[PDB]
Amino acid sequence: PQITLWKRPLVTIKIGGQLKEALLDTGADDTVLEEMNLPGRWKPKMIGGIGGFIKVRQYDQILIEICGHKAIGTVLVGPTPVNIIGRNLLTQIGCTLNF
Amino acid sequence: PQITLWKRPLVTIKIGGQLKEALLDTGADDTVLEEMNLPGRWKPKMIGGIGGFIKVRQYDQILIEICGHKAIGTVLVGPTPVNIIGRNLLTQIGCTLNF
Ligand SMILES: [Mg+2]
């Protein structure tokens, strides 16, 4: 689709059974998602927020659907305020900026 | 133009005489730029970063050029780590996300 930017670009994603609202965020390198159960193996990672650094769990090779477009990539899981789709998944769905 | 997202989407902007590198950031509501001299009237604003909240100066109705596309809008000026073009200017240049 084509997304204008007058409003936050919140889309529905499908991940690990579940529907979630998430932000399409071209200023984010990585994808970070609120607390959820993902199956396989993970490692801990630190990432920045307004408070300081939060610890999150890194799951690699996770299947996510983003507005009907399926991607595989790393998803970080932890106490983020906002569900953020970053560039590591936006490249996977072929998302560009256009003007 | 059309911008893929494999790399940070850093463009050249022209503002108040000067060339600057800045991030096209659809996760940012507002535009924040490193220390510079802008003419007219301003007010102070607080905004979030990794350390906590920083004070910035708000200048309204500023002319900025972004990859050859001229926009008018609010620019915040202060000790931000990264020059961020947010949605308040991206809408002004007709920037969309596409996939
Ligand atoms: Mg951000």
Curated annotation (Swiss-Prot), chains A, B:
Name all Peptidase A2 domain ranges. Answer: 20-89
Its taxonomic placement starts with: Viruses, Riboviria, Pararnavirae, Artverviricota, Revtraviricetes
What subunit structure does UniProt give? Homodimer, whose active site consists of two apposed aspartic acid residues.
**Residue ranges of the region described as Dimerization of protease:** 1-5, 49-55, 88-99
**Species of provenance:** Human immunodeficiency virus type 1 group M subtype B (isolate BRU/LAI) (HIV-1)
Give the protein name, as stated in the record: Protease
Catalytic residues? D25
| Source organism, top-level taxon | Viruses
Q: Which residues of the full protein are shown?
A: 501 to 599 of 1447
